[PDB]
Amino acid sequence: VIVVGNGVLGLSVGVEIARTRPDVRVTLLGKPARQYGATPAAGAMLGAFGEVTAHALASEHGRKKHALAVQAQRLWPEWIESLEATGTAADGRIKTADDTVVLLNTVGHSALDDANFAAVLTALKEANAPHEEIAVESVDWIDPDPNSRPLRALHIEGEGSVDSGILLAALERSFLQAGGRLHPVDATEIRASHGRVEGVVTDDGDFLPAGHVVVAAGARSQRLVAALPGLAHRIPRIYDGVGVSALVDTWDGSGPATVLRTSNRAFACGLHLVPRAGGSVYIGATNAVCLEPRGAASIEETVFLFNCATHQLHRGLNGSELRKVQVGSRPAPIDGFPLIGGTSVEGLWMLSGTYRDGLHMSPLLARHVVSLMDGGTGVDGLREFRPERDLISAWSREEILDDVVRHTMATGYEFPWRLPLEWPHMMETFLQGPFAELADRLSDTYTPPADLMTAIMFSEREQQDELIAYYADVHREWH
Amino acid sequence: TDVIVVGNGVLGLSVGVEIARTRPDVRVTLLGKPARQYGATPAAGAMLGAFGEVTAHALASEHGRKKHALAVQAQRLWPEWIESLEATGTAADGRIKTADDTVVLLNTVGHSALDDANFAAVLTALKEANAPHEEIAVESVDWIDPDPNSRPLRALHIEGEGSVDSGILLAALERSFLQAGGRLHPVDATEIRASHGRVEGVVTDDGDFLPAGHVVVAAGARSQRLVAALPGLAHRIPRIYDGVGVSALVDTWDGSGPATVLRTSNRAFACGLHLVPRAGGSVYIGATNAVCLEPRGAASIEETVFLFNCATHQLHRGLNGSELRKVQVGSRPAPIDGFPLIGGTSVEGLWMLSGTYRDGLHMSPLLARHVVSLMDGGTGVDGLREFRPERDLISAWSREEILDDVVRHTMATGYEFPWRLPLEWPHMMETFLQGPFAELADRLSDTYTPPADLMTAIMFSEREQQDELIAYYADVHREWH
Amino acid sequence: QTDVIVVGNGVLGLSVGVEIARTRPDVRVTLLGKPARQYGATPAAGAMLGAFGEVTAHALASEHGRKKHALAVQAQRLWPEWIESLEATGTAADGRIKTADDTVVLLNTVGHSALDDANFAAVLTALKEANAPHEEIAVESVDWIDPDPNSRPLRALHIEGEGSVDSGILLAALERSFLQAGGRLHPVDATEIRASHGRVEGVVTDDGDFLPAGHVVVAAGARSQRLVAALPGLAHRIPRIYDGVGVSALVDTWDGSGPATVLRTSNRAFACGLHLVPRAGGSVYIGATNAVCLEPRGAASIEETVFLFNCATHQLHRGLNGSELRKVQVGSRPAPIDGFPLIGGTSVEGLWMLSGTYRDGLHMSPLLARHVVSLMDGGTGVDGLREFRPERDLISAWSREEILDDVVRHTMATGYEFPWRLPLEWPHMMETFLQGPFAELADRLSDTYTPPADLMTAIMFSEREQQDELIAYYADVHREWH
Amino acid sequence: QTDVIVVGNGVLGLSVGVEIARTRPDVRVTLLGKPARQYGATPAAGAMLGAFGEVTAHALASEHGRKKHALAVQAQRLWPEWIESLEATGTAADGRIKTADDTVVLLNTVGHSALDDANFAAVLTALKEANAPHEEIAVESVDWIDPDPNSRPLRALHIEGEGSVDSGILLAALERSFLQAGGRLHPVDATEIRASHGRVEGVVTDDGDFLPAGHVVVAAGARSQRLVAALPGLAHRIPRIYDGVGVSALVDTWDGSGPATVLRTSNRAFACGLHLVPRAGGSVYIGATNAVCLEPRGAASIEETVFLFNCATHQLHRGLNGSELRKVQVGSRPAPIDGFPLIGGTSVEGLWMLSGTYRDGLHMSPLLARHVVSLMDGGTGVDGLREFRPERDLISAWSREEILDDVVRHTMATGYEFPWRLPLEWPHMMETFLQGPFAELADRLSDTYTPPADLMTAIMFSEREQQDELIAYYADVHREWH
Ligand SMILES: Cc1cc2nc3c(=O)[nH]c(=O)nc-3n(C[C@H](O)[C@H](O)[C@H](O)COP(=O)(O)OP(=O)(O)OC[C@H]3O[C@@H](n4cnc5c(N)ncnc54)[C@H](O)[C@@H]3O)c2cc1C
Ligand SMILES: Cc1cc2nc3c(=O)[nH]c(=O)nc-3n(C[C@H](O)[C@H](O)[C@H](O)COP(=O)(O)OP(=O)(O)OC[C@H]3O[C@@H](n4cnc5c(N)ncnc54)[C@H](O)[C@@H]3O)c2cc1C
C-alpha cells in the first residue's frame, strides 16, 4: 500500500492501515516542508456545530455532511488516547480545549451571522447536544472593543481543539510504531494499466510498486488522478482554498480556556482563537479560492485577520508578539463536497476535497476508506461523496446567485466599512446582473458554489473559457 | 381666592386643568406665550416612559427606586386622563395617544458599561413588577431597516408603555382648561409679589399687576430664577439649569411609520435614541441632552448630526432619504441636586412644580393631582413629600459614585459616535480623565457634589462660572448648616 | 399693448425688471411672484460671485464651457457699479449687498483626485491665461479656518476681486430699485401665457385675473419651461428645465466671528461643492448640496443636512460644530436638460425667456439682464449668448462616451467626499460594475440625445414610468427638429 | 599588543573594521559577532541614505540637532566613493549596493499638521540653505504610486543624490572588503572587556576564550553601553542606550514592479515614518515603526504590523494589498537616553565606542568610521563630532517645556496617523488632559535631566519599579558630574 500525501488525512489512513493489516507493507510519501499544507496552518477546531450555517442545513447534501461531523466528534477521545499512548509526557498534549464559545457581534452581515447563529442553536437542540446560551458578561478572558463586542454567546460542551502540529508529530510516531515506512519524496505520476494500479513514480526518478494507492495529497489530489485515461472529467476538480492564520505570544502569557469563534463568514472565512500550550494562541482564518496555488499570505489577509482578532476577541493581542504567519491550501472541491472512496481503477482510492473540516473528520474518513479496502461498506452516509461522479448540484442557480451577492456584501460589513447609507442597496442591485451573466455563460446545467464563483468572476478571460470547456466536457461524459 | 399658574408647559396646564375642574369656586389664570420660549413640552415626542427610563445607576439609589415607583403609578392614570381631555374636543382635533407599546433595542453603538447594564436592569425591573413584556427575535421587529454594522442583536417588547403627540396634548390641555372656566393670559411673569410672608400676586412683562392668594410656578427651567428674587430664597430653592434637547420631525420617504415606540436605554449624560410615531406620514426622532448654565433656543450642528446619524444607522436607513420638516429645541428643567421641586414654600400660597428633567410630561397627571391635593389641605401622593422645593441640596450619591459615573459617561460619548481609535487610546483617556474631574469636585465644595450631567457642563464652563458655583454651594451650606 | 410682464421674482426676474423699468420710463412694467418664493434658488444662495472658482477641467474641455467661463469674467466687471446703483435707492439701515471682495480656494483629500486635483490645476491655469490677480499661498496664512487635521487643506489659492453678496439684501435692493424706477409688484403667480396669431396677449394669474401685455419675460426659475410649453408646438421646441435642489444653512458662530474672504473648494460630485460665504452680524452661510430631481422638492433630506454639516465642520472650522443652526435653506437651481441656459427670444413675438442658469444665474444676472433688454430694444446684446436661444433642438456638447466616463467618476466621487472607509479593492470593483448599467441606460433613452451626468444619475434612480416618459420626450424632440 | 578588536558586526562595526584593515596593514584587526545578528538594526533597514529626508523642525531648532544634520550632509558626500571602493572587491554577480539615486518626500493629511506641515517646510528650507539639488514637483508626475484618494499626497519633493542601499548586499560587501584587506572574522560574542591601570588588555568571548588587544572599538548596537558600563566608574559616565525596536517588511509586488526612487514621508509620531525603498527582483522594502523599549524585543507586535501595512497600502500603493508578504523584519535602533550618539574615545586608553546612532547610523557609517580611525591614529577626526564623545554628562538639548509640548503633540499624532475618526471636540480635550500627567512625570524623574519625547512616552507607560530605577539612575549621573 502507498499513501500519497502526509497531511492529517494521509497519515490518519496510514496509521489505520498499518494497525489493521500487520501483514501488508504501507509506505507514505510527502516531504517535511508540507508545501501548501492545510494541516500545519490549522488551529485546529474539532468543528461540528460551530461549522453549521443556515445555507448548509438547507440542502440535503449539507445535512448529511453535518451528520458525519457529529459522528466524527464521538471518535476523537479514543483516537487521541491511541495516538498519545505511542509517546511520552514531553511530546505534548494533542487536545488543547474541551469546549467552544460561539460569539455573535455586529461586525458582519445580518443575512449570514444572524441566520447562522439561529441555525447553530437549532442544530444543537435537534441533535440533543449539551450547550447553553450564556450572558456575554460570563465569557472569561475576552476584552473586545465595545463597538465590536458580542451581545450573544453560546457555550458548546465537548466541541474542542487540537494542536495540529502535535497531532502531525503523534500520527507520524504512531505510523512508525505500527510498522509504516515514511519515504520523504513526492509522487509525480500514478501507474495503471488494464484498469489496475501498478504503483507510483516519485520525484527523484524512482518507481515504487503497489496493489493499493490512496491519494490524500490535499489540493494536488485530483490533478494527480486526472492524468489516467478518461478520469479528467470523472473526478471533480479540487482548487486551493488559501488560508492565513497566525501564532501569537500573548502580552501576559494567558489564553482562553475554550475555543472562541464566530459562525462562518464571507466565502467561508471566519474568526477564531484556538488555545495552545506555553503562552501562545492560534488566530485564524482567512479563505480565498485560487485557481493556482499560493504559498504566501497577502498584506490584505494579514491585516483583516489581525484587525478582527484585536477588535472582536481581545485588544491585548494588539500589544502581543507575532511569532508566525501560516499559509495552507484547504482542498476546495469544484462541486463543494468531498472526494472519498473507490475509483473505476482497482486499488485506487481518494481522500480529499474536505475544505474546512478534513482534520475534524480524519478518524471517521480513515476508518471508512480502510473498511472499503478490506471489503466492507464503511460508514453509511459517505456513499454520495464517492470520488468518481458527475458534479453535484446541491443548490439551484437562483440560491447560489443570492448567496454570492450576500457574501460579496458581507466582505464589506466584516471590514467593517463606513459608507453613505444608500450605497449598499445600490451595490446589491448592480452585483446581481454581472454574476447572473457569468453563471449563464459558464454552463446550462452546472453552477459553481459562491466561494468558487467569486474567484472565477475576478480571474482572466482565458481561465473562465477553460472552465466553460471543463463544464461542457463533464456534461458530455455523464449526460 | 384667585390662583395664578406661571407657565404653559404640560405641568402648568395640567395643574391648571385640575384646579379649574376641582375648584369651581376659585378663579384660575395661566400665564405664558404661544412661542413657549425654551419649552421642553413642544420639543418632546413624547414617550410615556416608566420601564424604558430604567437604568442600573437610577435603581442603585433609594431616591431613584422611589422615582421609578411613581412613574409606574403615573402610567395607570394616562388612559382616563386622555379620555377626559379628548372629550372636550371633536374628531378633527386628532388623537393624543400615538402608540400603546414600546420596543427597546440593544446594539453595540455605545458603552457596554451603560447599554448592557441598562438592558439587564430594564428586563429585571419588568419581571419584579410582573409587567407584561417579551424578549423577541430582532427579525420579528416590524419596519426597522438598520445598517447591519449598527443593528440590534436583542429586542424587548413592553406592553402598555406608549407615546402621546406632545402638540395635540398641549392643544387638548388648553381647550380643556378654557372649558372648565380657566383664563389664558398670554404674557410672562417678571416678578412674584410677597409681603408679611404671603403672595399678593404677579407683575407681568407688559407692566400690569395680577392679584392672587395662590401662585403655582411651573415655568420649566425659569422656575427657580423667578422664586429666588424673594428674600432668603436664593439659597433655599435649589437651582434649575437648562437640559437642552434637540429632536426632529421627519416626513418618511413612503409615508410609513412603526406601530410601536422604538428606543434604546438612556445613554451618555441622559441622552438617548428613540422614534415616536405620529399621524400623517411624520415620525418624531430624539433626543440629545446637554446641561447648559445659560439657556439656548437653537440646536448646535453637533446635536443635529449626532441625532440624524444615530436614527439613520440604528433605526431606519430610509430616514436618510426622508424630508426634514422641523428641528425642535427645548430645555429639560435640570435641578442642581438631580431631584424635582414639587410642593409648598415658606411663603403662604406660593407653590412650585418643576425640575422634572426627562419625565415631567409622563408624570404630569400624578404631579398635577398631588399639588392640587396639597393646595386643598390634603397630603397628595406619598413619597413626593421628599421633593419639597424649599430644601438643602440633596446628596443621593457619594462623590466616588459620581466621579466613576462622569468618566464612564464621558467615554460613552466616544462609543456612541461611534469613534474609530487605536485600541490602547480608550484605556489611556479613561486613566487621564479621573484626575481633572476629581480635582474639580474637591474645588467646588467640601460637602456638595453635582451629578454627572451637571459636572461635565461645569468642567467645560468658564472660570468665572465655576467660581460663581463655588460661592453658590458655600452660601447654601451657610443657610442650612 | 406696450405693457411688460416679468414672470418670476428671483434675481433674474427682478434684475431684468429693474433694467426694463430704468431703460423704458414710457412703458408699464409689472413683476409677478409671491414673497414665499416657493423653490426659490436665489434666497437659498450665499452667494459667491463665482468666475474662476467655478472653473472645472470638464467645463474648459468643451467649446460651450469655455464661452460660459468668458461671460462669467465679463459679468464680474459689472458688479461694482450694479451694487452702487442698487444701494443708492436705499439708506444705511438696509445693509450692504457686498459681503466679501476675495475668495480662497482650498485643496484637501476629502474627495476624488480625478475631480479636485484636475479642477485645482484648471483654476490655476485659467487665472494665469486671463492674467487675473491671484496668489498660491501657504495654508498656514489662511485666516480663521481651524479644520480637522485629517481633513485639512495642503494647498490654498487667494483670488482678488472674486467675492460674495448677501442674496437676501440683494433681493430687497432689487425690489426697492424696481419700485424706484416705476415698476409695479403684483404678488401672484402666472398660471397661463395667452398668445394668438403668433403674438403674446398677456398672462392669466392664479387669482383668476388677466393682465394684458405686448412683452412677457419668463424668469420663473425651474417652472419657466413648464409655463411656455403649454403654447402650441413649444412642448418639444423649448428644452426642459428640472430642479437642481440645493441645501445650505445659516449658522451663528460660537464667538460671533467669520472669515474675511469666501472659503470654497472646486466643484465636486454632480456640481455640489463646499463653501462658506461671510454675512454681517455674527452669522455665516454654508453650502451647498446639489441633486437633480424630476419633480420639485421644498425640504432638505437628512442625508443633505448631515453631508453639508460634516464637510463644513471638518474641512473649514471645527468651531462650527458648537455653533447654533439658525436656518436650513432649500432652493431649486434651474437645471436645463441639455446643460445650457435658455436666454432670449421665441417664435412668439414679445415672448422672452431667462432661465436654466443652474449654478451661476445670480453671478451673471447683471450681464443677462442687459442682454435680454438689448434684444427687446432691437439690439444684439452680448456676443456669445446667441447660442443659448431658448427655442432650439437639445444641444449635444459632449459625446456619449465623455458623459459615461463623467457619471461613473462623479458617482465614485460621492464616496470619496463622504469620506467612506472601504477595503482597498472595493472602489475598482464598483467602478467596473457601474459602467454597464449607465451605458445600457444611455442607449435605451435615445439614439441621438444623451443627458449630462447630473441629470443621468437622477434618471438612473427614477421610476420606470418617468424613464419611459423621457424616451417619449427625446423621440418627440427628434421628430420636431430632424 | 597593537592588535585591534571590533566588537559588533553591524554596518558600524564592519565599516570601522574595513577602514582600520585598509589604513593599518601592519596590525591584526579581529571583528566579533554571529551571523544571526540578534536584534540587529542593519539587516532590518531598507535602507535610506537619509540626510534631508530626516530633517524635522524640532531637530533644526536645537544647536545639538543642527550639528547632527551637518554631519549627515557630510556623510552623503562620502557614499559614491565608499560604494565604489566596496563594489571593487567583488564582481557583477554579487549585486548592486545602490538601489536608488533619488528620494521623493510626500505630504498627505494622514497625520498631524504640527509635525508633517512644519517638517515639510523645514526640509524645503534645509535643502535651500545647503544648496542641495531638489525640486517641488506635481504629485501627478510621481511614478508608480497608486494611493487611496482619501490618503493621497497633495505636495511632493524630489531630492537628487539622496538614495538607498540594499542593507543585506552592503553587509556582504563590507565582510568581503574586510577579508580582502586582511581582517579576521571570529563569529563569537564579547561577554566582557578587560582593562587595568586605565588601559585595555582585550576581550573575553562567549566560548570562554580571551583575545588580547591594545585597541577595542565597541559597535555592538543597543548592547554597547551595557558592555562598557561594567568597567569601574563608567556606569554613570557613559549614557545609557535603549532598544528603538523597528518593524519593516519585504513584499513581492503583485506585478514585480517597484518605484525608481525612495518614497517617504517626513518623520512622524515618536520617530516612526512611512517609506518604500526599492530592491532588485520584484521585491520592495516597506518601513518603519519605532518604539523605545526598556528591555530588548526580537518580534513585531500585531499593532506594528497592521500600522505599517495600513500606511503603505493607503498612502503609497493599493496594489501592495494584493502583494505577497515575504518577511517581517525586527531590529533595535540604538536609542541613547539623551538623544545623541556615543562616538569617540574614553578615559580608558585604546577603548573606543561607536553607537547610539538611532535612525541614521547606517547613513553616517563611512563618516563615523573615518572619524574613529583618525582619533586612533593620533588625529582629531571630523570637527562637529566633539559634543558626541561617549564619556559625558547627559546632554540637555531642549528645555523641559519644549519636550512636554513635543510629547503631547507626538501623542496626538499617533491619533491623526491611524487615522482615527472622533467627535470634533475630543482632540482639544485630550490635548489639555495630557499636559498634566507628563508635566508630573518630568518633575518626578529629576530636577535637571528630561528624557526626550521618544523615551518619555516609554517611561510614562512602564511599571513603577522601572520608573523608580530611572530616578536612581538620573540622580547617580548628577552625583558623578555635578
Ligand atoms: C488556515 C486553515 C485553517 C484550518 N482550520 C481548521 C479547523 O479549525 N478545523 C478543521 O477541522 N480543519 C481545519 N483546517 C483543515 C481542513 O479540515 C482541511 O480540509 C484538511 O487539513 C485537509 O487535509 P489533507 O490531509 O487532505 O491536506 P493537507 O493538509 O494539505 O496535506 C496534504 C499533503 O500532501 C502533500 N503533497 C502534495 N502533493 C504531493 C505529492 N505529489 N506527493 C506527496 N505529497 C504531496 C502536501 O505537501 C501536504 O503536506 C484548516 C486549514 C487551513 C488551511
Ligand atoms: C443652494 C444654492 C446656492 C447657490 N449659490 C449660488 C452662488 O454661490 N452663486 C451664484 O451665482 N448663484 C448661486 N445660486 C443660484 C444660481 O445662480 C441660480 O441659477 C439663480 O438663483 C437662478 O435665479 P432665477 O431668478 O432664475 O430663479 P429663482 O431664484 O428660482 O427665482 C424664480 C422665482 O419665480 C417664482 N415663480 C415660480 N413659478 C412662478 C410663476 N408661475 N409665476 C411667478 N413667479 C413664479 C419662484 O417662486 C421664485 O421666487 C445658488 C442656488 C442654490 C439653490
Strand content of chain A: 15-25%
- Distinct small-molecule ligands in the complex: flavin-adenine dinucleotide
Radius of gyration of chain A: 22 Å
Report the count of strand segments of chain A: 20
Oligomer: homotetramer
Q: Please report the two chains with the greatest interface, counting residues with C-beta closer than 8 angstroms to the partner's C-beta.
A: A-B, 32 and 29 residues
Note the overall shape of chain A.
Answer: globular
Count the DSSP helices of chain A.
11
Give me the secondary-structure category of chain A.
Answer: alpha+beta
End-to-end Cα distance of chain A, whole Å, is 35 Å
How is the main sheet of chain A built? 9 strands, mixed
Pfam families (chain A): DAO
Keywords (chain A): FAD, Flavoprotein, Nucleotide-binding, Oxidoreductase
Protein name (chain A): N-formimidoyl fortimicin A synthase
GO molecular function, one term (chain A): oxidoreductase activity
